[PDB]
């Protein structure tokens, strides 16, 4: 997995970012573990993880 650390820590922002990834990709894909971190399952290949992270980091 990869982890996103919020610049401004907040429970609601962490959960909304988790929902944004789940809506884009599918269910049970991202989960908020605290007010700051969100864990997203990612490919094992480093090239595929860069391609995967490219699509995820542009989500609104």
């Amino acid at each position: 997995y990869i982890t996103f650390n919020l610049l401004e820590s907040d429970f609601t922002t962490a959960q909304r970012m988790a929902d944004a990834v789940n809506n884009f990709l599918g269910p049970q894909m991202a989960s908020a573990v605290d007010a700051t971190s969100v864990r997203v399952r990612a490919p094992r290949d480093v090239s595929q993880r860069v391609a995967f992270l490219s699509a995820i980091e542009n989500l609104e």
Binding site: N23, F24, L25, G26, P27, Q28, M29, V40, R41, A42, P43, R44, D45, Q48, A51, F52, S54, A55, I56
Partner: protein
Amino acid sequence: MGKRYVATPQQSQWEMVVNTPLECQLVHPIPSFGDAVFSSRANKKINLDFELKMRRPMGETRNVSLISMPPPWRPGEHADRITNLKFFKQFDGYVGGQTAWGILSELEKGRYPTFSYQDWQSRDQRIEVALSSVLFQNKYNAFSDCISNLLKYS
């Protein structure tokens, strides 16, 4: 390394083409390959057509394998074999009955319905055609709303 036609997460899109009380149609463009079309029509009984429309028509009648492959961003998950179809020469691939609803279900779970077969236009080599589950859930909700609003008679 063989040929695999799938929309990348940045390329994947689902559209509701026909939204009327007489027909619902959901289209997924597979880049460089064609379209995947789910069509439901007003009838007394449950009906769903899945049509894999190809830009280059099918060269020969082939046995096709339909599998529910996990996407790359889902390590540790095995693939579920769904069924075996037969794609016919110069006809769009057709899946119907419970198998089309199964394809929709496997897309609703974040998985990739993958059709694998030997392509005549490709020196009879094995190729894969996958449907992407990115940006699918909203359009699946719109498609189900359309299905709920279909006339119950033909």
